[PDB]
């Protein structure tokens, strides 16, 4: 996260870290949506242009963290995966359209003051909150500058941008399953996600019922915090039926 601040303890209890076993390294961010399912971005697992194709046995999920490199004894929980599900129409050949994946944990995790699931939006919540100008929050342990890693989880709040502006900032073909967020060069406020933050959550707090909902997943960007550029996110509500389907087909 570039131009963000250190998170407070228990601020994002649904934040998850995808960690590689050998070499031991941070791969991406992810989110807890129930006691057995984690949501992330498909490019964190599969990306053939770079010979990237991870399997169940190559990863670990670490839940309840704050510090980026330390094993937080008696606070965090480490789980193994049972199954990984990538969206059938994820487009890694052109623009990362439908960049979403679900992972099933071997055993359910127990909630605590540091581990709690986030809610998935319903049509009406999505309709009222995904509006240009409204702010969301992104969290992660990724880089601090484009070219500089934090010791603790970082946070930044960003506004959703109008679709025309998103489309005129790049040469990539944007689709209805993506939205972009960030400040305009003219707003004198900065912030963006960067390397290491992919797969993590973009959340909003409902003023109707006071709950936090996950509206997007960190997907792609061109550089980090560049002026005239924005970050792109997967639109969770437009892919929700896919989500419901695998969960009540493969578990709960």
């Amino acid at each position: 996260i570039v131009e963000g601040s250190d998170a407070e303890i228990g601020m994002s209890p649904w934040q998850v870290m995808l960690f590689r076993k050998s070499p031991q390294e941070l791969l991406c961010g992810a989110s807890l949506i129930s006691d057995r399912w984690v949501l992330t971005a498909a490019h964190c697992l599969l990306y053939p242009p770079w010979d990237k194709n991870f399997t169940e046995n190559d990863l670990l999920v670490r839940i309840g963290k704050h510090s980026r490199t330390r094993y937080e004894r008696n606070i965090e929980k480490i789980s193994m995966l049972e199954k990984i599900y990538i969206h059938p129409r994820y487009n890694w050949r052109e623009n990362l359209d439908r960049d979403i994946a679900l992972m099933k944990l071997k055993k359910p995790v127990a909630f605590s003051d540091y581990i709690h699931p986030v809610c998935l939006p319903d049509r009406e919540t999505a309709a009222s909150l995904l509006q240009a100008g409204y702010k969301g929050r992104v969290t992660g342990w990724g880089n601090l500058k484009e070219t500089g890693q934090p010791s603790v989880l970082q946070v930044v709040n960003l506004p959703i941008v109008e679709r025309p502006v998103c489309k005129d900032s790049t040469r990539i073909r944007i689709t209805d399953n993506m939205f972009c967020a960030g400040y305009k060069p003219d707003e004198g406020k900065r912030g963006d996600a960067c390397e290491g933050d992919s797969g993590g959550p973009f959340v909003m707090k409902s003023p109707f019922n006071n709950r936090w909902y996950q509206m997007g997943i960190v997907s792609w960007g061109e550089g980090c915090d560049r002026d005239g550029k924005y970050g792109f996110y997967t639109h969770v509500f437009r892919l929700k039926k896919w989500i419901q389907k695998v969960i009540d087909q493969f578990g709960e």
Partner: peptide
Amino acid sequence: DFEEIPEEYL
């Protein structure tokens, strides 16, 4: 840079 995690998670 990362601290070691206990062996029963490998």
